[PDB]
Amino acid sequence: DMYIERAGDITWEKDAEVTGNSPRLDVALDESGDFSLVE
């Protein structure tokens, strides 16, 4: 029996920590909703 608990408001935070890169990848999506890399 799954249950939910509030974790916060959905708002943009000014001066939030900035990280992560922006890769461009060729991918395929199968009928089961799984993404895979196409090379």
Partner 1 sequence: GETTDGVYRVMTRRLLGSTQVGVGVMQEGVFHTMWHVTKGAALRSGEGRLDPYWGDVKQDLVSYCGPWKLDAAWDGLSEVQLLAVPPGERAKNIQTLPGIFKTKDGDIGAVALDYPAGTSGSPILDKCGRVIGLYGNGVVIKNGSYVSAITQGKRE
Ligand X SMILES: NCCc1ccc(NC(=O)c2cc(Cl)cc(NC(=O)OCc3ccccc3)c2)cc1
Which residues contribute to the site for ligand X (CB under 6 A)?
32-34
Tell the smallest beta-carbon distance from residue 11 to partner 1 (Å). Answer: 5
Nearest to 38 by CA among 30, 14, 6, 18: 30
Torsions phi, psi of 14, nearest 5? -70, 135
Contact set for partner 1, span 3-32 (CB under 8 A): 3-13, 16-29, 31-32
Q: Which is nearer to ligand X, 15 or 34 (CB)?
A: 34
In angstroms, how far is CA 36 from the centroid of its own chain?
Answer: 15
Query: Which positions lie near partner 1, rule CB under 8 A?
Result: 1-13, 16-29, 31-33, 35-37
